[PDB]
């Protein structure tokens, strides 16, 4: 059981750039193999026996290494190369994998569009109340959301979900859901979600007030 | 061309068993060693088991040893994996794979995978809730709407939007698990000249319960 460590865990590149990712091993390896996988598809073999290009794979891919240190290089990134890349070692059974390098497509900055929604009347009849905030079409991926209820920050009961990079414009989006009981929701008036991003000269604030209209 | 097709996946109770099959075509199956490899949801690859061309040599990952059995039927072009005493952490897409040569330890050809889900949760259809803006005036050339899809099991759900513009942008947010049940949401962004002036509905299909729900998005 050799342990394989892949670096970086996540990285981004623009088409035309050189890309290099590494795979180091806890003990000496005999051969290293490299695989590429995109969401909803099976992995495909890229490199076998450390430095051999697999049949049908583009020649911009190459592999190298020896002993305990290996690498995979893309001489010039193409947009279609964005994927997760896994290394796998041969020494003796068991066969083990690294945990992957996720190669994202680098893209121009984009600010999020923020939208807040109150709980529906249908949900309230069930005894629950979910307040939803969409932060859509931003780049890069790191973003912070903060909830306030009648002006007081709320952290408990928030759940965030991120999309994968959009297949059309390469941005990210995120949903933030604040879940309350019906009774708790109806004991407060103002609900606010606030997005802070690298692009934001000021945090983007969206709110609604239950007793307004 | 070489082709590998897995079958047999599905929902399994904790502690239960399941037998997977892999059908081979386009090569002399009896001449090649074969592998199973699995991938838990949103995680990496993990090798599971190997069987040589004539079944003489078998290896297992330590984490499935004693529970899983790999076998093959060479005249009928089929690889098997019998699983027993299954646990939550065995939930994964299961792939069969083989190499270029007789018994080499790497994966040149892969099937499409069959999904095994280990859970005691009961199959439950979702509650579908519309996400419409609160009361108030709006500005800008576009408006965003959503649907909240709550408390379903198992995972498989598809949300499709009907709107009045081909330019409409849809985001599908990955489901999160709670108390054995899933919740997801979906947003749509449309030009503000098409809503509420034209109808917008989300259609939520949950095949495992053979249910489909349509929710019209109504203004405040």
PDB file of C-alpha atoms in Angstrom, chain B:
ATOM      1  CA  UNK B   1     -13.986  -2.241 -30.983  1.00  0.00           C
ATOM      2  CA  UNK B   2     -13.577  -3.200 -27.331  1.00  0.00           C
ATOM      3  CA  UNK B   3     -16.711  -2.685 -25.238  1.00  0.00           C
ATOM      4  CA  UNK B   4     -17.455  -3.340 -21.540  1.00  0.00           C
ATOM      5  CA  UNK B   5     -21.013  -2.975 -20.183  1.00  0.00           C
ATOM      6  CA  UNK B   6     -21.771  -3.223 -16.457  1.00  0.00           C
ATOM      7  CA  UNK B   7     -25.162  -4.106 -14.984  1.00  0.00           C
ATOM      8  CA  UNK B   8     -26.706  -5.106 -11.675  1.00  0.00           C
ATOM      9  CA  UNK B   9     -26.476  -1.876  -9.675  1.00  0.00           C
ATOM     10  CA  UNK B  10     -29.272  -0.437  -7.581  1.00  0.00           C
ATOM     11  CA  UNK B  11     -30.415   0.299  -4.043  1.00  0.00           C
ATOM     12  CA  UNK B  12     -29.210  -2.026  -1.276  1.00  0.00           C
ATOM     13  CA  UNK B  13     -30.109  -2.159   2.410  1.00  0.00           C
ATOM     14  CA  UNK B  14     -27.176  -1.918   4.839  1.00  0.00           C
ATOM     15  CA  UNK B  15     -25.843  -5.405   5.467  1.00  0.00           C
ATOM     16  CA  UNK B  16     -27.224  -6.669   2.159  1.00  0.00           C
ATOM     17  CA  UNK B  17     -25.752  -8.279  -0.945  1.00  0.00           C
ATOM     18  CA  UNK B  18     -25.670  -7.465  -4.655  1.00  0.00           C
ATOM     19  CA  UNK B  19     -24.146  -9.205  -7.686  1.00  0.00           C
ATOM     20  CA  UNK B  20     -22.715  -7.076 -10.521  1.00  0.00           C
ATOM     21  CA  UNK B  21     -22.040  -8.258 -14.078  1.00  0.00           C
ATOM     22  CA  UNK B  22     -19.773  -6.944 -16.823  1.00  0.00           C
ATOM     23  CA  UNK B  23     -20.297  -8.025 -20.431  1.00  0.00           C
ATOM     24  CA  UNK B  24     -17.258  -7.995 -22.730  1.00  0.00           C
ATOM     25  CA  UNK B  25     -17.181  -7.755 -26.540  1.00  0.00           C
ATOM     26  CA  UNK B  26     -14.690  -6.956 -29.296  1.00  0.00           C
ATOM     27  CA  UNK B  27     -11.705  -8.895 -27.892  1.00  0.00           C
ATOM     28  CA  UNK B  28     -10.816 -12.441 -26.811  1.00  0.00           C
ATOM     29  CA  UNK B  29     -12.100 -12.123 -23.241  1.00  0.00           C
ATOM     30  CA  UNK B  30     -10.474 -15.370 -22.073  1.00  0.00           C
ATOM     31  CA  UNK B  31      -7.034 -13.980 -22.894  1.00  0.00           C
ATOM     32  CA  UNK B  32      -7.003 -11.014 -20.491  1.00  0.00           C
ATOM     33  CA  UNK B  33      -6.987 -10.276 -16.811  1.00  0.00           C
ATOM     34  CA  UNK B  34      -9.839  -8.084 -15.580  1.00  0.00           C
ATOM     35  CA  UNK B  35     -10.424  -5.563 -12.790  1.00  0.00           C
ATOM     36  CA  UNK B  36     -13.160  -3.814 -10.847  1.00  0.00           C
ATOM     37  CA  UNK B  37     -12.559  -0.155  -9.832  1.00  0.00           C
ATOM     38  CA  UNK B  38     -15.027   2.008  -7.915  1.00  0.00           C
ATOM     39  CA  UNK B  39     -15.716   5.689  -7.260  1.00  0.00           C
ATOM     40  CA  UNK B  40     -17.746   7.011  -4.348  1.00  0.00           C
ATOM     41  CA  UNK B  41     -19.943  10.049  -5.104  1.00  0.00           C
ATOM     42  CA  UNK B  42     -17.818  13.183  -5.640  1.00  0.00           C
ATOM     43  CA  UNK B  43     -14.642  11.267  -4.626  1.00  0.00           C
ATOM     44  CA  UNK B  44     -11.685   9.583  -6.333  1.00  0.00           C
ATOM     45  CA  UNK B  45     -10.961   6.199  -7.880  1.00  0.00           C
ATOM     46  CA  UNK B  46     -10.327   3.117  -5.732  1.00  0.00           C
ATOM     47  CA  UNK B  47      -9.232  -0.243  -7.133  1.00  0.00           C
ATOM     48  CA  UNK B  48     -11.378  -3.166  -5.852  1.00  0.00           C
ATOM     49  CA  UNK B  49     -10.363  -6.537  -7.328  1.00  0.00           C
ATOM     50  CA  UNK B  50      -8.392  -8.377 -10.042  1.00  0.00           C
ATOM     51  CA  UNK B  51      -8.818 -11.785 -11.699  1.00  0.00           C
ATOM     52  CA  UNK B  52      -6.309 -13.253 -14.174  1.00  0.00           C
ATOM     53  CA  UNK B  53      -7.292 -14.557 -17.591  1.00  0.00           C
ATOM     54  CA  UNK B  54      -8.001 -18.120 -16.411  1.00  0.00           C
ATOM     55  CA  UNK B  55      -9.065 -17.292 -12.815  1.00  0.00           C
ATOM     56  CA  UNK B  56      -5.841 -18.766 -11.361  1.00  0.00           C
ATOM     57  CA  UNK B  57      -4.750 -15.520  -9.625  1.00  0.00           C
ATOM     58  CA  UNK B  58      -7.084 -13.173  -7.696  1.00  0.00           C
ATOM     59  CA  UNK B  59      -6.342 -10.047  -5.640  1.00  0.00           C
ATOM     60  CA  UNK B  60      -8.627  -7.857  -3.516  1.00  0.00           C
ATOM     61  CA  UNK B  61      -8.332  -4.447  -1.917  1.00  0.00           C
ATOM     62  CA  UNK B  62      -7.955  -4.989   1.825  1.00  0.00           C
ATOM     63  CA  UNK B  63     -11.165  -3.026   2.467  1.00  0.00           C
ATOM     64  CA  UNK B  64     -13.355  -5.560   0.556  1.00  0.00           C
ATOM     65  CA  UNK B  65     -11.454  -8.778   1.370  1.00  0.00           C
ATOM     66  CA  UNK B  66     -13.664 -11.447   2.913  1.00  0.00           C
ATOM     67  CA  UNK B  67     -16.860  -9.736   1.674  1.00  0.00           C
ATOM     68  CA  UNK B  68     -16.509  -9.489  -2.124  1.00  0.00           C
ATOM     69  CA  UNK B  69     -15.913 -12.298  -4.638  1.00  0.00           C
ATOM     70  CA  UNK B  70     -14.668 -11.733  -8.204  1.00  0.00           C
ATOM     71  CA  UNK B  71     -15.315 -14.445 -10.819  1.00  0.00           C
ATOM     72  CA  UNK B  72     -15.675 -14.902 -14.581  1.00  0.00           C
ATOM     73  CA  UNK B  73     -17.399 -17.040 -17.222  1.00  0.00           C
ATOM     74  CA  UNK B  74     -14.956 -17.148 -20.124  1.00  0.00           C
ATOM     75  CA  UNK B  75     -17.135 -18.950 -22.742  1.00  0.00           C
ATOM     76  CA  UNK B  76     -19.941 -16.413 -22.128  1.00  0.00           C
ATOM     77  CA  UNK B  77     -17.795 -13.249 -22.006  1.00  0.00           C
ATOM     78  CA  UNK B  78     -18.840 -12.129 -18.512  1.00  0.00           C
ATOM     79  CA  UNK B  79     -17.047 -10.801 -15.429  1.00  0.00           C
ATOM     80  CA  UNK B  80     -18.840 -10.857 -12.047  1.00  0.00           C
ATOM     81  CA  UNK B  81     -18.470  -9.145  -8.656  1.00  0.00           C
ATOM     82  CA  UNK B  82     -20.488 -10.565  -5.769  1.00  0.00           C
ATOM     83  CA  UNK B  83     -20.781  -8.116  -2.855  1.00  0.00           C
ATOM     84  CA  UNK B  84     -21.975  -9.036   0.647  1.00  0.00           C
ATOM     85  CA  UNK B  85     -22.299  -7.345   4.053  1.00  0.00           C
ATOM     86  CA  UNK B  86     -22.506  -4.002   2.265  1.00  0.00           C
ATOM     87  CA  UNK B  87     -21.997  -0.699   4.108  1.00  0.00           C
ATOM     88  CA  UNK B  88     -22.681   2.992   3.498  1.00  0.00           C
ATOM     89  CA  UNK B  89     -19.070   3.552   2.437  1.00  0.00           C
ATOM     90  CA  UNK B  90     -19.416   0.921  -0.336  1.00  0.00           C
ATOM     91  CA  UNK B  91     -21.802   3.307  -2.139  1.00  0.00           C
ATOM     92  CA  UNK B  92     -20.072   3.984  -5.440  1.00  0.00           C
ATOM     93  CA  UNK B  93     -20.118   3.740  -9.181  1.00  0.00           C
ATOM     94  CA  UNK B  94     -18.570   0.330  -9.993  1.00  0.00           C
ATOM     95  CA  UNK B  95     -16.473   0.060 -13.194  1.00  0.00           C
ATOM     96  CA  UNK B  96     -14.943  -2.959 -14.879  1.00  0.00           C
ATOM     97  CA  UNK B  97     -11.667  -2.415 -16.699  1.00  0.00           C
ATOM     98  CA  UNK B  98      -8.879  -4.244 -18.536  1.00  0.00           C
ATOM     99  CA  UNK B  99      -5.397  -3.446 -19.864  1.00  0.00           C
ATOM    100  CA  UNK B 100      -3.710  -3.731 -23.259  1.00  0.00           C
ATOM    101  CA  UNK B 101      -1.868  -6.946 -22.350  1.00  0.00           C
ATOM    102  CA  UNK B 102      -2.525 -10.281 -20.609  1.00  0.00           C
ATOM    103  CA  UNK B 103      -2.125  -9.346 -16.958  1.00  0.00           C
ATOM    104  CA  UNK B 104      -0.841  -5.864 -16.708  1.00  0.00           C
ATOM    105  CA  UNK B 105      -1.842  -3.702 -13.719  1.00  0.00           C
ATOM    106  CA  UNK B 106      -3.481  -0.700 -15.384  1.00  0.00           C
ATOM    107  CA  UNK B 107      -6.781   0.261 -17.017  1.00  0.00           C
ATOM    108  CA  UNK B 108      -6.799   0.892 -20.775  1.00  0.00           C
ATOM    109  CA  UNK B 109     -10.499   0.139 -21.387  1.00  0.00           C
ATOM    110  CA  UNK B 110     -13.385   0.994 -19.016  1.00  0.00           C
ATOM    111  CA  UNK B 111     -17.106   0.296 -18.921  1.00  0.00           C
ATOM    112  CA  UNK B 112     -19.661   3.031 -18.296  1.00  0.00           C
ATOM    113  CA  UNK B 113     -20.218   2.023 -14.649  1.00  0.00           C
ATOM    114  CA  UNK B 114     -23.168   0.724 -12.622  1.00  0.00           C
ATOM    115  CA  UNK B 115     -24.264   2.568  -9.480  1.00  0.00           C
ATOM    116  CA  UNK B 116     -24.687   0.796  -6.123  1.00  0.00           C
ATOM    117  CA  UNK B 117     -26.332   2.841  -3.334  1.00  0.00           C
ATOM    118  CA  UNK B 118     -26.299   1.453   0.230  1.00  0.00           C
ATOM    119  CA  UNK B 119     -28.897   3.093   2.483  1.00  0.00           C
ATOM    120  CA  UNK B 120     -31.836   2.258   4.748  1.00  0.00           C
ATOM    121  CA  UNK B 121     -33.732   5.349   3.541  1.00  0.00           C
ATOM    122  CA  UNK B 122     -37.137   4.700   2.021  1.00  0.00           C
ATOM    123  CA  UNK B 123     -37.829   5.801  -1.532  1.00  0.00           C
ATOM    124  CA  UNK B 124     -39.603   9.162  -1.125  1.00  0.00           C
ATOM    125  CA  UNK B 125     -40.822  11.638  -3.772  1.00  0.00           C
ATOM    126  CA  UNK B 126     -39.787  15.288  -3.422  1.00  0.00           C
ATOM    127  CA  UNK B 127     -41.799  18.257  -2.265  1.00  0.00           C
ATOM    128  CA  UNK B 128     -41.422  20.937  -4.946  1.00  0.00           C
ATOM    129  CA  UNK B 129     -41.612  24.595  -3.917  1.00  0.00           C
ATOM    130  CA  UNK B 130     -41.512  27.664  -6.196  1.00  0.00           C
ATOM    131  CA  UNK B 131     -38.909  30.358  -5.536  1.00  0.00           C
ATOM    132  CA  UNK B 132     -40.468  33.640  -6.660  1.00  0.00           C
ATOM    133  CA  UNK B 133     -39.287  37.139  -5.685  1.00  0.00           C
ATOM    134  CA  UNK B 134     -41.011  38.916  -2.857  1.00  0.00           C
ATOM    135  CA  UNK B 135     -43.222  41.896  -3.523  1.00  0.00           C
ATOM    136  CA  UNK B 136     -41.588  45.027  -4.880  1.00  0.00           C
ATOM    137  CA  UNK B 137     -40.552  46.698  -8.098  1.00  0.00           C
ATOM    138  CA  UNK B 138     -37.722  45.225 -10.159  1.00  0.00           C
ATOM    139  CA  UNK B 139     -35.209  46.612 -12.641  1.00  0.00           C
ATOM    140  CA  UNK B 140     -32.687  45.154 -15.056  1.00  0.00           C
ATOM    141  CA  UNK B 141     -33.097  43.226 -18.275  1.00  0.00           C
ATOM    142  CA  UNK B 142     -33.476  39.868 -16.493  1.00  0.00           C
ATOM    143  CA  UNK B 143     -35.193  38.164 -13.545  1.00  0.00           C
ATOM    144  CA  UNK B 144     -34.147  35.012 -11.692  1.00  0.00           C
ATOM    145  CA  UNK B 145     -36.548  32.332 -10.439  1.00  0.00           C
ATOM    146  CA  UNK B 146     -36.099  28.956  -8.804  1.00  0.00           C
ATOM    147  CA  UNK B 147     -37.545  25.701  -7.564  1.00  0.00           C
ATOM    148  CA  UNK B 148     -36.652  24.031  -4.273  1.00  0.00           C
ATOM    149  CA  UNK B 149     -36.806  20.231  -4.441  1.00  0.00           C
ATOM    150  CA  UNK B 150     -36.843  18.856  -0.912  1.00  0.00           C
ATOM    151  CA  UNK B 151     -36.885  15.591   1.000  1.00  0.00           C
ATOM    152  CA  UNK B 152     -36.532  12.924  -1.703  1.00  0.00           C
ATOM    153  CA  UNK B 153     -34.736   9.592  -1.985  1.00  0.00           C
ATOM    154  CA  UNK B 154     -32.894   8.210  -3.940  1.00  0.00           C
ATOM    155  CA  UNK B 155     -30.727  10.870  -5.595  1.00  0.00           C
ATOM    156  CA  UNK B 156     -31.840  10.726  -9.256  1.00  0.00           C
ATOM    157  CA  UNK B 157     -33.910  13.866  -9.989  1.00  0.00           C
ATOM    158  CA  UNK B 158     -34.201  16.019 -13.139  1.00  0.00           C
ATOM    159  CA  UNK B 159     -35.530  19.598 -13.205  1.00  0.00           C
ATOM    160  CA  UNK B 160     -36.471  21.100 -16.575  1.00  0.00           C
ATOM    161  CA  UNK B 161     -37.596  24.689 -17.122  1.00  0.00           C
ATOM    162  CA  UNK B 162     -40.206  26.009 -19.541  1.00  0.00           C
ATOM    163  CA  UNK B 163     -39.754  29.717 -20.302  1.00  0.00           C
ATOM    164  CA  UNK B 164     -40.277  32.285 -23.029  1.00  0.00           C
ATOM    165  CA  UNK B 165     -36.709  32.720 -24.257  1.00  0.00           C
ATOM    166  CA  UNK B 166     -34.041  30.472 -25.736  1.00  0.00           C
ATOM    167  CA  UNK B 167     -31.494  32.724 -23.979  1.00  0.00           C
ATOM    168  CA  UNK B 168     -32.614  31.485 -20.549  1.00  0.00           C
ATOM    169  CA  UNK B 169     -29.762  30.309 -18.315  1.00  0.00           C
ATOM    170  CA  UNK B 170     -30.279  27.357 -15.956  1.00  0.00           C
ATOM    171  CA  UNK B 171     -28.192  26.379 -12.940  1.00  0.00           C
ATOM    172  CA  UNK B 172     -28.601  22.982 -11.266  1.00  0.00           C
ATOM    173  CA  UNK B 173     -27.282  22.884  -7.713  1.00  0.00           C
ATOM    174  CA  UNK B 174     -25.899  19.578  -6.397  1.00  0.00           C
ATOM    175  CA  UNK B 175     -28.095  17.801  -3.865  1.00  0.00           C
ATOM    176  CA  UNK B 176     -27.188  17.711  -0.178  1.00  0.00           C
ATOM    177  CA  UNK B 177     -28.074  14.788   2.070  1.00  0.00           C
ATOM    178  CA  UNK B 178     -29.924  15.242   5.368  1.00  0.00           C
ATOM    179  CA  UNK B 179     -31.511  12.632   7.661  1.00  0.00           C
ATOM    180  CA  UNK B 180     -31.371  10.148   4.791  1.00  0.00           C
ATOM    181  CA  UNK B 181     -33.114  12.507   2.344  1.00  0.00           C
ATOM    182  CA  UNK B 182     -31.870  14.817  -0.399  1.00  0.00           C
ATOM    183  CA  UNK B 183     -32.564  18.479  -1.142  1.00  0.00           C
ATOM    184  CA  UNK B 184     -31.565  20.379  -4.268  1.00  0.00           C
ATOM    185  CA  UNK B 185     -32.545  23.565  -6.054  1.00  0.00           C
ATOM    186  CA  UNK B 186     -32.501  24.898  -9.598  1.00  0.00           C
ATOM    187  CA  UNK B 187     -32.541  28.489 -10.841  1.00  0.00           C
ATOM    188  CA  UNK B 188     -33.509  29.983 -14.179  1.00  0.00           C
ATOM    189  CA  UNK B 189     -32.689  33.491 -15.412  1.00  0.00           C
ATOM    190  CA  UNK B 190     -34.904  34.932 -18.143  1.00  0.00           C
ATOM    191  CA  UNK B 191     -35.365  38.356 -19.744  1.00  0.00           C
ATOM    192  CA  UNK B 192     -37.656  40.476 -17.589  1.00  0.00           C
ATOM    193  CA  UNK B 193     -39.965  41.057 -20.568  1.00  0.00           C
ATOM    194  CA  UNK B 194     -41.000  37.370 -20.450  1.00  0.00           C
ATOM    195  CA  UNK B 195     -42.046  37.045 -16.774  1.00  0.00           C
ATOM    196  CA  UNK B 196     -44.590  37.440 -15.302  1.00  0.00           C
ATOM    197  CA  UNK B 197     -45.940  38.257 -18.776  1.00  0.00           C
ATOM    198  CA  UNK B 198     -45.199  34.728 -20.048  1.00  0.00           C
ATOM    199  CA  UNK B 199     -45.524  31.505 -18.082  1.00  0.00           C
ATOM    200  CA  UNK B 200     -42.533  29.923 -16.347  1.00  0.00           C
ATOM    201  CA  UNK B 201     -42.800  26.421 -14.873  1.00  0.00           C
ATOM    202  CA  UNK B 202     -40.316  23.953 -13.444  1.00  0.00           C
ATOM    203  CA  UNK B 203     -40.936  20.256 -14.097  1.00  0.00           C
ATOM    204  CA  UNK B 204     -39.388  17.880 -11.560  1.00  0.00           C
ATOM    205  CA  UNK B 205     -39.183  14.181 -12.428  1.00  0.00           C
ATOM    206  CA  UNK B 206     -38.186  11.618  -9.787  1.00  0.00           C
ATOM    207  CA  UNK B 207     -37.948   8.339 -11.731  1.00  0.00           C
ATOM    208  CA  UNK B 208     -37.427   6.109  -8.684  1.00  0.00           C
ATOM    209  CA  UNK B 209     -40.928   7.045  -7.475  1.00  0.00           C
ATOM    210  CA  UNK B 210     -42.335   7.466 -11.018  1.00  0.00           C
ATOM    211  CA  UNK B 211     -43.524  10.975 -10.131  1.00  0.00           C
ATOM    212  CA  UNK B 212     -43.396  14.244 -12.064  1.00  0.00           C
ATOM    213  CA  UNK B 213     -44.465  17.595 -10.596  1.00  0.00           C
ATOM    214  CA  UNK B 214     -44.931  20.892 -12.449  1.00  0.00           C
ATOM    215  CA  UNK B 215     -44.868  24.161 -10.484  1.00  0.00           C
ATOM    216  CA  UNK B 216     -45.843  27.434 -12.126  1.00  0.00           C
ATOM    217  CA  UNK B 217     -43.895  30.468 -10.941  1.00  0.00           C
ATOM    218  CA  UNK B 218     -46.379  33.151  -9.863  1.00  0.00           C
ATOM    219  CA  UNK B 219     -45.641  36.788  -8.985  1.00  0.00           C
ATOM    220  CA  UNK B 220     -46.274  38.026  -5.441  1.00  0.00           C
TER     221      UNK B 220
END
